[PDB]
Design a protein around this ligand. Structure first.
Ligand SMILES: Nc1nc2c(ncn2[C@@H]2O[C@H](COP(=O)(O)OP(=O)(O)OP(=O)(O)O)[C@@H](O)[C@H]2O)c(=O)[nH]1
Ligand SMILES: Nc1ncnc2c1ncn2[C@@H]1O[C@H](COP(=O)(O)OP(=O)(O)CP(=O)(O)O)[C@@H](O)[C@H]1O
Ligand SMILES: COc1cc(C(=O)c2cnc(-c3c[nH]c4ccccc34)[nH]2)cc(OC)c1OC
Ligand SMILES: Nc1nc2c(ncn2[C@@H]2O[C@H](COP(=O)(O)OP(=O)(O)O)[C@@H](O)[C@H]2O)c(=O)[nH]1
Ligand SMILES: [Ca+2]
Ligand SMILES: [Mg+2]
Ligand SMILES: [Mg+2]
Lengths: 316, 437, 54, 427
């Protein structure tokens, strides 16, 4: 029998994962503060990482990577990219972003394009620095708003892509073969959060990969793999390997895996941009069962075995 | 030359003291009968090894040490052991019944009956020192004597020798080799009482030593002998600068200067490499780069913690064996590229390096193989606070129900001393967090 | 980077390598504490013998 | 560190005689009192239970007490009866009559000072005295009434010494008299306050083990006391043989007793062995561990799954791999975490002794401070209240000067003890 403990009751993903483990008949959920667990589905904040790996006779796994917050916070991510040579100053795939605390770097580069007549529309989206910058004082990230988003028709609809990524204890990087397209239902005027019409062109403003592939073929004579996903795999891999020496648990007394959500936006010229990385993501409703079983298969059962894959291994 | 006095309190301190002084005798060429033919100054001298040894007219070299335990069993084996002649009978002080794993009994009821005698025996050692720099105190967090009596002695030493440095070698409790359920209580009480009276404390987690013996020495069930002999190698590395000629860490004062920028944050992490089994037939000798890089592996540290998720305030590299500075600097440049080593912004990112050419000495019939080079890293990193969080959490679990507290209150202690000690621990954890993030 | 204060001797050498630069109670109160626990311990003992006498 | 042993009453002297019989064989001491053994380990800690007499003769530091001469004349007649010091037989003539009041207040009051004289003489010749070991039953009059009176007297003279008892609890399946619940309830009120550790030896459990597990159809007291003697030898293994823990009565109390009144232990043993029947297959380290935690090996008739373990001490005897014992003991805690309190970390302690008990190559002794012991006290309480609500059989006690209020107090105190075990079961 294996032991596990739940410490984030709002995790739709790991509530699904925990019910899967119990229903295997070889896992038993413990009290939330029982130290003798094999697996910890931990809280999102102040996870007691310093307490893992000190139980004699117990192999301990945790569904979070200590130090992964540096990729999953806007101010730190923007810092991490510019300051790290792996992501190499201004790489091609991250919008120009700046840390301004509620300033000098913004004015120098931005004002060049307000003079130069190239669209100066950073982002709460304005074109006047004072309008938005003085507003935020009522930390924040000032990012260029890409003014030429990819046209999606019928409907002239802006969109964003979410790919779920699982990193196991051995730092294998797994890209779930099923990504989600979150769609804006109303046309664009020269935000796609599903939290903010709905249902007109496709169910619940969620378009899938089999469908978006055919749109790209029929409309644009191209494949999803060739046009977008190749750029996505490169951005995921570059991000997660840059921080691998900082967060890997290869030689640690406890082990980490963690599921991420990557956010991309595709421009008119079919260039892929990184929006944000989310350390606690929620799967699409249709895809929950497939992904949560893949987590158990490759993240949990790999360490705790019992007695065709759904992932793409991003090689490094 | 300024003399240093070693005080070994409780079972753990005494048995670790045995292995340390045994190792010192081998390193300095002193026989179990106290004679050192190496010493051509007969009856005295001011050599570097005279920091730890005094001389008699008969040429016997005597450790400047005192062993104290509230119960006679452990120290009696020292009186009858291989090094019987090494120590003067007055140097070994024993009580009659121990503290029963109770800090209060060690500190208050039983400890108060022997404290005056111990200080007088210590004073006899001090009066044969031309310039006493301070004390090195070996004790456990967990035991009643190692916890309660040590804090009592440290308070009186602060009063009597207020100008002298006090360093600790503290054994942090681990369930793999545990002796008592109330060890988290004893740990918090003794740490709180001793915090301002200690200038530098080297914590050794019994869990780390245990796994190192299993993993790297292939001993399935390590005994106290296995753990202590490995611990003495680390201790010998830390104290070698006091006993041999060198420019780095030559007095106890320098340990605080190099390792301790803030007084409360005075627990440096120790990492030792390489640990190789004597029974390993074929072994490939590791280079300067390999052993230095091992200093940043948590599996070689004396406490298991992640320095990547903390900040450094100081870093010392103590080498023994075939090591030259150009190899050290080339290795450091290499490690800096590949590892997460981040300092606080008000400290320079630099290493203090000391090299002793004679390689580590090993006891014949021991578990460690002879190596051609070794290193002990002393880093002051906030990551060591993980051990404080682990201990404090265990304290909270029991204390929330006042489990076993009646044993302490039964000896005169008050419930408020528990909460007072825990608040100081909570403050210590917060100091570490502010510096670390 | 910069190697400073190299000192050598026949036993070894020591130096510093810098990669980047930076950006008590008295004996009196001891006895007051110890005797205050002693009176509590003696009081609790006297309560025992009083209870036994009943 | 020496211990003073006291056996009182019929039951106390019997299991007491068996205990000296068993451990003397383990230490190589014959009925003459002479050591004829093959190892120095037998003598390393022999001073704990034996005095040294002229010509290297070993004498148990034991005091035999009864208000009736008969059972003690049996002890002298017994196999090891001549080993005991003759001056340590202290007996009355009338007897207690299964009356707690007679043992505590009247008949026992006359003899108590004579016993303390022997206890004092034994104590004076001790270099460092840990405390006292008493064997008695709680259902009779002498061991119950006078045994607790002795415990109170000894605590008065030795308030800083450990008091430890082996207390046999009454069961209607092994019952001499209907008043045993009265005697037991009055005795538990004393033990809750004047002992540091009490091993609860339930006659119901001893009977059930003999009937169900050992397939003994009509078990005698000799069958029952074979189980008690094996348990007492195992429970005292760390005292009698050298170990890494450097173990004593106080450290056991400090580590096992989180709250002063919850000091009533559930002993366990494995392999469960019938008298004379030889065991040819030695057990495996996994088998010992599963049996020792099995409810069917407990000597108190309680279900450990009905409560939670506050602390546990496990003693393994024989030549076995300590790694396997560690793995196996770690396996039980990790497998059954729910029955160990989380607010006492590392509350299970394991010890190993190379010397095995006679007739076995592998043996395991279990000592648990479980909140499930409230079931035993609830059972005594229910039997007590059944008679007390009608004031039945009270005249036996009010005839000796006792008042009803003392019964109400003892009833109330035991129900307080039950509620305290209940409190930490849900904590
Ligand atoms: N590394 C190491 N740890 C030890 C040794 N002896 C005991 N310990 C540890 O020390 C703690 C118990 O402290 P002890 O030194 O045994 O107790 P004490 O200081 O003699 O005090 P008393 O309770 O009065 O016996 C436990 O955590 C043990 O794991 C030893 O020789 N080496
Ligand atoms: N440079 C940019 N150009 C165009 N649109 C942008 C943009 N930066 C962000 N957006 C849009 O803002 C929307 C939401 O903002 P943001 O990227 O900060 O959070 P998010 O998309 O990851 C949802 P959540 O914050 O709840 O996890 C995205 O859908 C994106 O379309
Ligand atoms: C008196 O005879 C024993 C004495 C001791 C003993 O002195 C002791 C010392 N330290 C501990 C413990 C440390 N942590 C624990 C957790 C649960 C139980 C005990 C401990 N016990 C232990 C025994 O059994 C292992 C004994 O045999 C019954
Ligand atoms: N195991 C065991 N139990 C006994 C023995 N004799 C009596 N008992 C139990 O002890 C209780 C009677 O107490 P007893 O010791 O005989 O009375 P006392 O002599 O006045 O102390 C009953 O519950 C009996 O079941 C015995 O020899 N061996
Ligand atoms: Ca000399
Ligand atoms: Mg001790
Ligand atoms: Mg009878």
């Amino acid at each position: 029998m294996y032991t596990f403990v739940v410490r984030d009751e709002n995790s739709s993903v790991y509530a699904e994962v925990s019910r899967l483990l119990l229903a295997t008949g070889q896992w038993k959920r413990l009290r939330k503060d029982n130290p003798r667990f094999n697996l910890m589905l931990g809280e999102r904040n102040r996870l007691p990482f310093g307490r893992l790996g000190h139980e004699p006779g117990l192999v301990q796994l945790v569904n979070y990577y200590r130090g992964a917050d540096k990729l999953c916070r806007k101010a730190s991510l923007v810092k991490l990219i510019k300051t790290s040579p792996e992501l190499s100053e201004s790489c091609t795939w991250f919008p120009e972003s700046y840390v301004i605390y509620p300033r000098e770097v913004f004015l120098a580069a931005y004002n060049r394009r307000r003079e130069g007549r190239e669209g100066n529309v950073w982002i709460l989206i304005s074109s006047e620095a004072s309008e938005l910058l003085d507003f935020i004082d009522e930390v924040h990230v000032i990012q260029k708003y890409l003014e030429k988003p990819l046209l999606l028709e019928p409907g002239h609809r802006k969109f964003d892509i979410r790919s779920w990524v699982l990193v196991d204890h051995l730092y294998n990087i797994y890209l779930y073969r099923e990504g989600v397209l979150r769609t804006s239902s109303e046309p664009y005027n020269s935000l796609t959060n599903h939290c903010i019409n709905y249902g007109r062109y496709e169910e619940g403003n969620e378009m899938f990969f089999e469908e978006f592939n055919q749109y790209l073929m029929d409309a644009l004579n191209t494949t999803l793999e060739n046009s977008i996903l190749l750029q996505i795999k490169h951005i995921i891999r570059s991000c997660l390997m840059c921080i691998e020496p900082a967060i890997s648990t290869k030689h640690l007394h406890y082990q980490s895996f963690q599921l991420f959500g990557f956010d991309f936006m595709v421009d008119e010229e079919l260039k892929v941009w990184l929006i944000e990385v989310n350390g606690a993501p929620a799967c699409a409703q249709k895809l929950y069962a497939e992904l949560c079983q893949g987590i158990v298969d490759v993240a949990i059962s790999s360490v705790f075995p019992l007695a065709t894959s759904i992932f793409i291994k991003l090689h490094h | 030359m300024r003399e240093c006095i070693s005080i070994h309190v409780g079972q753990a301190g005494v048995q670790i003291g045995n292995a340390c002084w045994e190792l010192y005798c081998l390193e300095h060429g002193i026989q179990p009968d106290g004679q050192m033919p190496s010493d051509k100054t007969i009856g005295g001298g001011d050599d570097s090894f005279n920091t730890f040894f005094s001389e008699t007219g008969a040429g016997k070299h005597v450790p400047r040490a005192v062993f104290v335990d509230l119960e006679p069993t452990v120290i009696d084996e020292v009186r009858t052991g291989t090094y019987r002649q090494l120590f003067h009978p007055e140097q070994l002080i024993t009580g009659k019944e121990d503290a029963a794993n109770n800090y209060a009994r060690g500190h208050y009821t039983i400890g108060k009956e022997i404290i005056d005698l111990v200080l007088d025996r210590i004073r006899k050692l001090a009066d044969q020192c031309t310039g006493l720099q301070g004390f090195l105190v070996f004790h456990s967090f967990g035991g009643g004597t190692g916890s309660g009596f040590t804090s009592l002695l440290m308070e009186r030493l602060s009063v009597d020798y207020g100008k002298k440095s006090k360093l600790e070698f503290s054994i942090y409790p681990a369930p793999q080799v545990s002796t008592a359920v109330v060890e988290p209580y004893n740990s918090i009480l003794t740490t709180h009482t001793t915090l301002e009276h200690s200038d530098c404390a080297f914590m050794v987690d019994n869990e780390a030593i245990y796994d190192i013996c299993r993993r790297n020495l292939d001993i399935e069930r390590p005994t106290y002998t296995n753990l202590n002999r490995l611990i003495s190698q680390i201790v010998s590395s830390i104290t070698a600068s006091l006993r041999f000629d060198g420019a780095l860490n030559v007095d106890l004062t320098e340990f605080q200067t190099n390792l301790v920028p803030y007084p409360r944050i005075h627990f440096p992490l120790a990492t030792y490499a390489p640990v190789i089994s004597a029974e390993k037939a074929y072994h490939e000798q590791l280079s300067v780069a390999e052993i230095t890089n091992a200093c940043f592996e948590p599996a070689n540290q004396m406490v298991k913690c992640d320095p990547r998720h903390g900040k450094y305030m100081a870093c010392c590299l103590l080498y023994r064996g075939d090591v030259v500075p150009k190899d050290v600097n080339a290795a450091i440049a290499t490690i800096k590229t590949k590892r997460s080593i981040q300092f606080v912004d008000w400290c320079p990112t630099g290493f203090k390096v000391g090299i002793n050419y004679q390689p580590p000495t090993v006891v014949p019939g021991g578990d460690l193989a002879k190596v051609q080079r070794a290193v002990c890293m002393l880093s002051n990193t906030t990551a060591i606070a993980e051990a404080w969080a682990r201990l404090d959490h265990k304290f909270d679990l029991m204390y929330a129900k006042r489990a076993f507290v009646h044993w302490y209150v039964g000896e005169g202690m008050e419930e408020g001393e528990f909460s007072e000690a825990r608040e100081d621990m909570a403050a210590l954890e917060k100091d570490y967090e502010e510096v670390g993030v | 980077m910069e190697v400073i204060e190299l000192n050598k001797c026949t036993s070894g050498q020591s130096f510093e390598v810098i990669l980047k630069p930076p950006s008590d109670p008295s004996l009196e109160e001891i006895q007051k504490k110890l005797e205050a626990a002693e009176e509590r311990r003696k009081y609790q003992e006297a309560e025992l013998l009083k209870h036994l006498a009943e | 560190r020496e211990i003073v042993h006291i056996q009182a009453g019929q039951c106390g002297n019997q299991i007491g005689a068996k205990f000296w019989e068993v451990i003397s064989d383990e230490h190589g001491i014959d009925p003459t009192g002479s050591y004829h053994g093959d190892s120095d380990l037998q003598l390393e800690r022999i001073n704990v239970y034996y005095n040294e007499a002229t010509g290297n003769k070993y004498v148990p530091r034991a005091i035999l007490v009864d208000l009736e001469p008969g059972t003690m004349d049996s002890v002298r007649s017994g196999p090891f009866g001549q080993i005991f010091r003759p001056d340590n037989f202290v007996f009355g003539q009338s007897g207690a009559g299964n009356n707690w009041a007679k043992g505590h207040y009247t008949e026992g009051a006359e003899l108590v000072d004579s016993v303390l004289d022997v206890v004092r003489k034994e104590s004076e010749s001790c270099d460092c005295l840990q405390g006292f070991q008493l064997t008695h039953s709680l259902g009779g009059g002498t061991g119950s009434g006078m045994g607790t009176l002795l415990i109170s007297k000894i605590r008065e003279e030795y308030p800083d010494r450990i008091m430890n008892t082996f207390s046999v609890m009454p069961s209607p399946k092994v019952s001499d008299t209907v008043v045993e619940p009265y005697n037991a309830t009055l005795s538990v009120h004393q033990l809750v306050e004047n002992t540091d550790e009490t091993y609860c030896i339930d006659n119901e459990a001893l009977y059930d083990i003999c009937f169900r597990t050992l397939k003994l159809t009509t078990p005698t007291y000799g069958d029952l006391n074979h189980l008690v003697s094996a348990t007492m030898s195992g429970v005292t293994t760390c005292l009698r043989f050298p170990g890494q823990l450097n173990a004593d009565l106080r450290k056991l109390a400090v580590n096992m007793v989180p709250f002063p009144r919850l000091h009533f232990f559930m002993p366990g043993f494995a392999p469960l062995t019938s008298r004379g029947s030889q065991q040819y297959r030695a057990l495996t380290v996994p088998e010992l561990t599963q049996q020792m935690f099995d409810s069917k090996n407990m000597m108190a008739a309680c279900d450990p799954r009905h409560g939670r373990y506050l602390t546990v001490a496990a003693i393994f005897r024989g030549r076995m791999s300590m790694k396997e014992v560690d793995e196996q003991m770690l396996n039980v805690q990790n497998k059954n975490s729910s029955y160990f309190v989380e607010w006492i970390p590392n509350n299970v302690k394991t010890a190993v002794c190379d010397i095995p008990p006679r007739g076995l190559k592998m043996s395991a002794t279990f000592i648990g401070n479980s909140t499930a012991i409230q079931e035993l006290f609830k059972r005594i309480s229910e039997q007590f209240t059944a008679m007390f609500r009608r004031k039945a059989f009270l005249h036996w006690y009010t005839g000796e000067g006792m008042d009803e209020m003392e019964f109400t107090e003892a009833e109330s105190n035991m129900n307080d003890l039950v509620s305290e075990y209940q409190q930490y079961q849900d904590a």
